[model samples]
Target: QNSSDWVTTDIQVKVRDTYLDTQVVGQTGVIRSVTGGMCSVYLKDSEKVVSISSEHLEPITPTKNNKVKVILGEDREATGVLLSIDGEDGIVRMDLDEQLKILNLRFLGKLLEA
Candidate 1:
């Protein structure tokens, strides 16, 4: 568990439409182990450890900022730095190299260090 926040504490998990359901929808848990990109969470509600994708988990505390995978054309995506979230202006920008893409929020996902 190499000193990651998801391993150190409970994280909110989201698993939907995936072939495997992580821990039903509203359960929180401590990650027992991470294998490949999947995490084994010791669920608080069910008392049963369940396997979930590490990408499905979100830390309980808000992250200062996050790297996101921005959707491009159909079946295409790009890694971008989330620059700013201008709520008032409804302008969120993510940059890929010298190009910047104004995001629609639907395309962002947690960036995996891998």
Candidate 2:
């Protein structure tokens, strides 16, 4: 694991101002595709695809009923539905096991509908 591994198609992300100069900063988007360190994102509001570096993107915290994925730890790469948030932990019902498991907020990435 490299940092870029955390980002993948359909994952919702927030744009950072570190690399680009535009109003897209702090806005949310779904990753359309990824090529190495760069990715194309479709901003929900603008409804436009923008090329951005993975370094300038970050995962968004999910709320109840939000589709999410495990981006880190033993459950890395697993997709799930968020059941609830308990402080720093998130209760997720994993798609693979069909069982509820608690994961840290840092390890969860909200997924957008495809």
Candidate 3:
């Protein structure tokens, strides 16, 4: 899948300096919208939305009991609950069928609180 698929609204993400200004790099935010390959991220630190390219976004891993979404792999876009983090992988229980899926930390994004 293309890198753009990993960036979607409502998922928490970390900003990167790949194509963004250094001031914004390393900041954490939630994606507010996406168009083309660009995303509008609502940064908690600045409490504002900033336009960023999909290539400069990184998924934020969820802790135990936190809700998450699969941003990569066959189950991409699937929602689940984080069960635990074992090494570089996360053990998640899929919300649809209660089946567990082990995914790399980079393949999951933490969902925003409802």
Candidate 4:
């Protein structure tokens, strides 16, 4: 396929910097739209666009969604929607029963699709 024929609907992406070899300095995002050299992307579990680039953009298969089971406690879990994810801090905000709540990255229990 031609480069211009390349476009993504909903895809998982891994973004990496070229300067350093450290694996920790990377990010995961969703590519909502792509037209040739330009890309619109967002961090994992987020809706807002974080970066747009023509380089260092990679598409990873086994695509998935953001909805998940929120682990409130050991014995309690709630159906939640992942509203926003802060890539810098790895913090996530969830919407549970119409109430917005902040949760640590660890509490983002499981991917419901799993």
Using TM-score as the measure, the top candidate is 2
Clash count, one per candidate: 0, 0, 0, 0
lDDT at position 30, candidate 2: 92
Global lDDT for candidate 2? 0.81
Pairs that clash in candidate 3: none
lDDT, candidates in the order shown? 0.48, 0.81, 0.80, 0.49
lDDT at 88, model 4: 41
Question: What number of backbone clashes does candidate 3 have, counting pairs of residues 3 or more apart or in separate chains?
Answer: 0
Error of 3 at 109 (Å): 1.0
Task: Name the candidate, 1 or 4, with the larger TM-score value.
Answer: 1
Candidate 4 lDDT at 13 equals 54
Query: What TM-score would each prediction reach against the true structure?
Result: 0.39, 0.83, 0.80, 0.39
Instruction: Write model 1 residue lDDT over 1-114, tens digit each, in one string.
Output: 353323222223444434255436655555556565567766667778778765665433222255555433341355555656545321234454645556555444444332
- Model 1 alpha-carbon miss at residue 38, Å: 15
- Give the better candidate number (2 or 4) by lDDT: 2
- Candidate 2: list runs displaced more than 4 Å: none
lDDT of 2 at 59: 79
TM-score, cand. 3 vs. native? 0.80
The candidate that achieves the highest lDDT relative to the unseen native structure? 2
Error of 2 at 32 (Å): 1.8
